[model samples]
Target: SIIRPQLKFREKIDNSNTPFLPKIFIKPNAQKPLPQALSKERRQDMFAHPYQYELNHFTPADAVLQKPQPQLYRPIEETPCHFISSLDELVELNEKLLNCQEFAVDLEHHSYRSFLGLTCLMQISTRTEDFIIDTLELRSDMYILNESLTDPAIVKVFHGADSDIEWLQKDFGLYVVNMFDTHQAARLLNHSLDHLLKLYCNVDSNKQYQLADWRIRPLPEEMLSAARDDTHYLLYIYDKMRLEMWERGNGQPVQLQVVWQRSRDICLKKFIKPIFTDESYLELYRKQKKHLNTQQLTAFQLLFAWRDKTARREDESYGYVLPNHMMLKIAEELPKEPQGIIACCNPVPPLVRQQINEMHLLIQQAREMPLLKSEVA
Candidate 1:
């Protein structure tokens, strides 16, 4: 449940000779408690069996979207580019985008940098203009663009759109009513983005900056250029592909329309319901249960659960906290002492090194505790 916060602006008075200071009063709701950090004991208890957590457990605090004056940012390019950072600008931006009958869309995602996965930036393009929406700055206020997304009259075009639609809906609760995924177009199942651009636009799309972090401010010129190309030429590619599909349908307009309609239907059906895809280390170990012995499996389960919870609470990547292979090695070795655990998984991050006692206790608990059928089965 989403709980709305009540804020009161007030001034605070000083008893001493100091002057009064202005302050905002935030009243915490009694029914809602912040997501508490998991203690060492609580961590083990929660993972004794298969555990489930909601994807939206964490919410932004005191997010107020202000209506600021619109300012458009355009880099050096043939097509004009706009950068939107505030809710007011997004509203005005979407107004322009809504007028367009069709537009190309793509999302840059960040998984290695965030706890789960994050939608870092949204790239949108019409035939004449390109726009990059700063998702990190907009956050929940991004739903303001929902009007454009769910507009039945407009066509949202994309190359590979499954994950894009999923993340957009998950992060902002916006759904696409009309979609055209180019990847689903006739006989292009295995075609790459660069291949399509090279074939249609006759320009070599640079492969550089493909892995750059989109969460950073003042993105590099090369990165912005790469992002611009992702959607900038997509509308052109869509036109070329539709012609090919038209020929494939033997110049029959109805058959070609059916092909596109079917593709859109399939794309929408794929993301109609959100799926849970962020697997914890415990889930990974359990999936590969046949490879380990009873004792080894126990150690793997405990260590994996601890790592998963720690990463979520601290908002660190799984590999940054503990690599999967290192966790498995620690389990296989069944390190009894603190030094043995350290030596087995040596050169761990300072944060993990600080929790050496908790790690040892977790292993010891797994050893003494009875192996329930639920743990293995």
Candidate 2:
């Protein structure tokens, strides 16, 4: 059963209307639980996917590409990538970005270790320069760059921008006004950047770093290459895709214009924070399909609930605080002693090690009979 209503866009989108750049950081930011001030309904509203209803802003029926956007291709290894960790570099970069007619953008984001995932870094490529901006360091102040990013005149290109746009809104309070998603152009979702890069660009995009720990400071040299690969050649792909769409559409170029509108519609999305609710743990249980008796089920629910609280309290991801399987194992075994609880987890989490007694007590409570000797069943 649905517990929440489908999300709706807060603003009407059209060529005449500017983007609605919601200020998630108006009072600045945090690594905290979803704010508790709002009612449950209002809180649920924050987490719903904003694209549920159809995106109404399609390109004008007569729209057509006047010319393919400009692109400059260079060897990923040969290009110099700037690491912007301070305000001065960000300021300097922002100035040059404003001059560009269009540029490529990408983000390296992570959620597995932190509560409310953060945008680890941002990559932007103009024709000559490639930038790997330090988003985590410059996060609170990133809104300043919106002066350029939200300018409708500059077209921002992204390979698959759905997640990137949300991360930009969450971590930087930045919004895109005019943008293109290359995936929308190439005609698919399962076909990733790797498929596009290899198929069209004839390049090997490594998969090793897809889930690497991006929170590492002083990023490794190899990671720098992988990160830059996200956008270094993206603008080139956008140019190439533009031509292919027109060619494939025959003389009409109807499909080519449709791709442009689809990309335009993508920029209209708004990012909202997600909230946790009471029945959230059951959804996990439903997925695992593990059978449990009354005691085991009770223990599972108690342990899962505990994990959520611990994770939120420590600003850790649920997995980092307590992996799902580990929690289920502890619950299944109904560990009576603290050592028994510790034994259930292969490598004990720091939180568990400290809360060993608390875990034992929860399991013990779950084991208690609803009816005592004083009452008949």
Candidate 3:
């Protein structure tokens, strides 16, 4: 097969030293260790505080929900659970993994806040065996994907991989070399009728809550179902999509795969989160105020930008950041003091106050852009 070559300011932290203009902090490689599984007692505990254990996985049942590692990743389960936890166990498993020809790739997206885009819930699946990678808890050991990007021997199979690869790279600096995109293949095969993976694979993703507030206190059933949707039947669907593609003809699937593989190697980072549908283009429309003929419009644009950055920095959702109401107040009053605006604003997060200067600067620059009457109208 043809294998191709591969290719932030924390702070609101000065990332200026980095050559490229990172929209956000340059994602550091994850170095956290894999979580241990939950025991029966631990499982009961997890059921009690489902959300907490989900947040941190030291308990067995609550141990970040890892599926049994398959002996082999295929239509049937091959690998048995050895109950190993440390790096030694992973190395032991690696022996079996080395013999495996390929692996499955999948990502979980949590889309609670419309502003932050989608944070990964989990990255999981099986080829040699299953791995449930907790994206929230960063780990050094989990850097396997970022490290093994160029391995020609391992075939990296995925579905709808464009956004997945981009998020992975941007979030964890994970890069992939060889890839097989199943969703693209599915589209090519059933160009006639939209083929849902569920119809073919027999697992429905309707119950999964990949789009819910993953950071919430207690992960709702819908959320866990959504989380599970990311990997459940992924292996089966890949096989089905591949078989169908092979039968139809090699051309379409091959072309799609090549393009997708290219995307994996070179991720086009857009802030847009595919999983989150609550995107607001108010700022986009507001920019038209300059054309309409008003100086204040630029201020409005800056307000939007400030809101976006402020919300993201605070780790609060966009609406929680300033909300449309508070944004309007800022536009109308342009409060200069902490008490002046902060008093009126819904509890301003700690980090929000720190960036007040930059926020003001951003607003000032935006206002200078020029404005008009029709633009606001």
Better of 1 and 3 by TM-score: 1
Look at candidate 2 and tell me the lDDT of residue 345.
86
Estimated TM-score per prediction?
Answer: 0.69, 0.78, 0.55
Per-model CA lDDT versus the true structure: 0.61, 0.68, 0.45
Model 1, 1-377: lDDT tens per residue? 11111111021111222322111011111122222222323222311110111111211111101111222222236678889878898999888988986788988887663454667788999877898888766765676676677555666778877678667754554556556677776444335576777776667877533587676667777777788788887777766666666555565454344435554554443222212222455567667754555676678878777877776655556787787788888877777888788887657765569888999998787667565575563
lDDT of 3 by residue, 1-377 (tens): 11100101122311122322212111122133222222323222211211222113211121111222323124423532232234454445445544545556666664334333444354345543455444444323333444343343455666667767656644543545455566655555542112344466554455443244454434454554455445545655555555555445543344344434443443333323322211243454456442322434445567676665555444456565566666655555545554555655677744446766765675556556554544553
Among the numbered candidates, top TM-score falls to: 2
Candidate 2 per-residue C-alpha lDDT over 262-331 given as tens digits, one digit per residue, 9 for 90 to 100: 7767666666445554356566666777555667777877887787777665556888888877987877
| Deviating ranges (above 4 Å) for candidate 3 | 1-97, 110-119, 127-129, 147-149, 191-194, 216-225, 250-319, 323-377
lDDT of 1 at 370: 66
TM-score of 2: 0.78
- Cα deviation in Å at residue 215, candidate 2? 1.1
Give the candidates in order of TM-score, highest first. 2, 1, 3
* lDDT pick, better of 2 and 3: 2
- RMSD (CA, Å), candidate 2 to true, equals 9.6
Give me the runs in candidate 2 sitting further than 4 Å from their true place: 1-64, 69-72, 188-190, 207-209, 251-253, 275-294, 371-377
Supply candidate 2's per-residue lDDT for 25: 30
Candidates ranked by lDDT: 2, 1, 3
Q: List the residue pairs that clash in candidate 1.
A: none
